[PDB]
């Protein structure tokens, strides 16, 4: 009762190992849950190209992710997308909002990902994902997600202008120190839920973290969110931006922490 879809095509990647991090995450989920992922797109090396160049390059991959996710959303299973970059969600979030106009999108990310072509400082498409899905600029892959239905969770240190774009659109922001499970449940109310996770939301993991207050979200906070959302309300989950080389012990250790965070939701969907 889980559908696993895996992006392996470049979607504006500026990091070297996010396609590889996606592949390793999918492999861990295949082994734990007895699943076989549907792998979409062909890898291409990372580059520092402008969104206006990277976006057309990604069209084939984005269109294929859209069709796979659409079928899954219309079916009876939990839709799980393991995505190299948040930019894959320019294809999926318009489908979520059209199929489930009452869904709340929990966009869990250390960033706001709410830049527009006018406001981006770096030209990076991955900084423009949530604004594109919400129609502030035209990605060519649709929009229709109400900003009033989007909640940024874990975001912090947002550029002043971007923060005002978020505010004016009506996107709520729950910073890591407010992002308890109940705070998230309060934001969702009775709505069905789509969860999008960018792993740079997580506090850089240190061992003796008992005596300092973290700046990012802790894995335990992410797990508590997955424990809190009722399985009957969970539409789907996107896991994005694990930058870890294939065959590395780093990737091995990272996917074990990921599986621990997602287990309450994925175990329930499987059984
Ligand atoms: Mg479903
Ligand atoms: Mn992101
Ligand atoms: Mn981010």
Curated annotation (Swiss-Prot):
EC number(s) on file: 3.5.3.25
Effect of gene knockout: Cells lacking this gene do not produce cycloserine (DCS).
InterPro entries attached to this UniProt entry: Ureohydrolase, Ureohydrolase_dom_sf
GO process terms (BP): antibiotic biosynthetic process; arginine catabolic process to ornithine
Binding sites annotated in the UniProt record for Mn(2+) 1: 109, 113, 198
Catalytic reaction equation(s): N(omega)-hydroxy-L-arginine + H2O = hydroxyurea + L-ornithine
Enzyme class, broadest EC rank: hydrolase
Cellular component GO terms, alphabetical: cytosol
GO MF term list: arginase activity; hydrolase activity, acting on carbon-nitrogen (but not peptide) bonds, in linear amidines; manganese ion binding
Entry keyword set: Antibiotic biosynthesis, Hydrolase, Manganese, Metal-binding
Cofactor requirements of the protein: Mn(2+)
Function: Involved in the biosynthesis of the antibiotic D-cycloserine (DCS), a cyclic structural analog of D-alanine, used as an antitubercular agent. Catalyzes the hydrolysis of N(omega)-hydroxy-L-arginine (NHA) to yield hydroxyurea (HU) and L-ornithine.
UniProt name for this protein: N(omega)-hydroxy-L-arginine amidinohydrolase
Species this chain originates from: Streptomyces lavendulae
UniProt lineage: Bacteria, Bacillati, Actinomycetota, Actinomycetes, Kitasatosporales
